């Protein structure tokens, strides 16, 4: 049911160990792309939707809200509430924010935007992205903000598309 | 995966979810053969053994022979072991019959379980945790419940392994 | 333990944790004479607490035992610590023994901020209530001659009643 | 700390845990003076207890120390816990400084009714026996000048005769 | 407890806060010795270090000297460690001046941390994600703040830790 | 599908079958299949002071692939894998012929903080000592089986030991 429900396969757990891993998208393996140099932890799950290509030849980076950590390489039903933008060294850096569907979970049904997540996890998903790669020689963030979930939607829309044209 | 070295006496166990694990009930999509997340538990719970199934088996509701493995400290999701049933707990839920196999690991894997024969030889603490288990974790679940019939021995779960090994062939 | 029983009681209470959310099925327990930690059994259920789980320090309630305390926080917190929490609301329950009431407490605002929002169990997630109605419900099912009998739900003037009265039970005792 | 050695001694003692099974490679020891948790020393080999440790308090070895205990559960305890239990054997050691026996014990049927068949160590698991005395054997091969010499398991009459000796010991001092 | 067997060389530190922790700032209760929940991190950090306290201390700020404490896996909370000075961060926070000591094992408890001898011989990745984290723990916390000054060497760190066991001892 | 690395011998892929510190279960991925089975439990108690996995297409002497010890500052999981380089290399022989051990640590791109680990005398020697104590007891309680540590090698050796199993792999 794109683009209010999408797959995400799970890279890097809730609260994990600082290893930032990735999946190979050619042969579908779990990499460590490097480890983390601050010591910060992801403050939700964080995966790609597969099949979605976006810009920068990335798929598109999804943070999924959930009650206790999945591990690597689940696939999670998820809907989008909104989208932190951002532009780093090497351009535009948008991660949507998702919750799980309500057939996993009742508990975020009420979540319909950014502004209906806890303020407090808001602010730490920010602080994360903002900060998490300050000792990674050579790059930088900004925090364009966050937007809502009908960008966030357009977001997937246009990155599915992006990846059909492609193949 | 073969289903097993020595069927129906040896077997392998896809492990789904991992004993004493997190809240979160994991489903290999059988299509694709990726671990999805199929909801999450709403009971405070966890699985006393590690959970699975049998590959390449067909039981009467169309999934494979679901398998608790015991094992001394926990697996994670998606390996395989290489177990033997010693019993089998008989239930029933509002989709019908529903029964789960209990093995232990082969002799190869450990030593330690050889004197484990059948589910009377297993702890009783064990046995009562995890048809307890069973009977509750999905009581806040709409629409459901479920009822414990009893356990059978070794014969009758390795009758469940054979019976639903030729469904899967023919079908 | 020479700790208080809260900075502002009963609206701002001391919380003794003696078993963590999500921990291990040990169930600790201080013994109030000596004030050490002490395995009384082993949970026979393959259930957590949802909560973390403790008492406040010089209460006395009816049967001789100190005001048992839930309390929600964002990760676990461990046995022995203390944190300074509010009473949202108490579950009422029945059982072998009597009577067993237990409060459901959150942090205090200085502690998280977070939590200024949650009033009254009603404001608590509902799927937490209703799963730690059905642990304590269950989590005693295969210890012999025991049950469980949940009342319900009370408010938080219910709540800070039973803590005053303890309080004031405790301080009779001394 | 006031803690006593036990309720009905030497059939059931009270044991102070020090380090969790399977936790992770830091050598905790009480301060048996002031009760504190303190570092001993990092473990400098890849091993783990396969068991909890600890002591019961108001005991004194031959050597003066306080009577170690190896004790079993289904999941870890937590350095600082106390637990009632009762001994199925010992494991007689000695090391650098002298003896170094280890009680073996199960917790009592109060807390869990699961170990009610254990009365002697060779009801214990084999598998977890020899793990026993293979850790105890070579979690000191890195530390230069400190060793084990395994002298082999005795059953519990003998454990409890080493811990009614032990407390014996304690009382004299204070005598 | 004591500040130590030979200070200020050698210091005793009671341990608050576990490396690579859960996000609980917890803090002992310097009256009672009781371990209190101070607050929750707001921000996804944990300590790169185990971070704690020297008994009989007494800062500047009324409180005892704080101490990162590293060790080549997590300690617990409320365990006391000897260890020794390798140097200082200095800071200024909400409530003024704030320098925390950097501090190893002493040699009796481990001889990996023996060739450390000043803040210069710790990896350079730690030094940096130690500072990182005080710069920034803060940074969502209503009317709390911190400016990260820089380091300074061991006899400097000595110097504190003299100078603050001082006070005690006339208070 | 993974190939044996970037830049051959000098860089290569590990795919992690035990993590660093890890439950005492001896997986291994069966080449066949690609799945991760049990291969037994352990029977000591001790766990892998590094993570453990193999390059992929690498045939060693044995007709197994070629064996890597992988440092890195937290563990891994099963199935990962790691683009690392050689540093030296564990020699032994055991009840089954020889068998050797890499030792490598991750590339630069991974992390700067093993760019000075050149050679195994690079690694501090309290880690050398506890993997070489490691392989040389973890098996001690298996029947019929014994190890003899003959020594570490160099960077040189190691990748030399990498650059004839691709070749035998591909021959
Ligand atoms: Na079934
Ligand atoms: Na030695
Ligand atoms: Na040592
Ligand atoms: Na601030």
């Excluded at 996890?121 to 900060?131: A, N, P, T």
């Excluded at 925090?143 to 193949?167: F, L, M």
Aim: include cysteine.
């Amino acid at each position: 049911d794109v683009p209010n429900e999408v797959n995400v396969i799970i890279e890097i757990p809730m609260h994990g160990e600082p290893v930032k891993y990735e999946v190979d998208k050619k042969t579908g393996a779990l990499f460590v792309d490097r480890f983390m140099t601050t010591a910060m932890f992801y403050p939700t799950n964080y995966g790609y939707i597969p099949n979605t290509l976006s810009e920068d030849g990335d798929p598109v980076d999804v943070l999924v809200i959930t009650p206790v950590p999945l591990i690597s390489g689940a696939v999670i039903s998820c809907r989008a509430v909104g989208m932190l933008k951002m532009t780093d060294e090497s351009g535009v850096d948008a991660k949507i924010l998702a919750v799980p569907t309500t057939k996993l979970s009742k508990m975020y049904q009420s979540m319909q935007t950014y502004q209906d997540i806890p303020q407090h996890l808001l602010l730490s998903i920010e602080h994360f992205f903002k900060h998490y790669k300050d000792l990674e020689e050579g790059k930088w963030v900004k925090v364009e903000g966050w937007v809502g979930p009908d960008a966030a939607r357009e977001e997937i829309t246009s990155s599915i598309n992006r990846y059909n044209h492609t193949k």
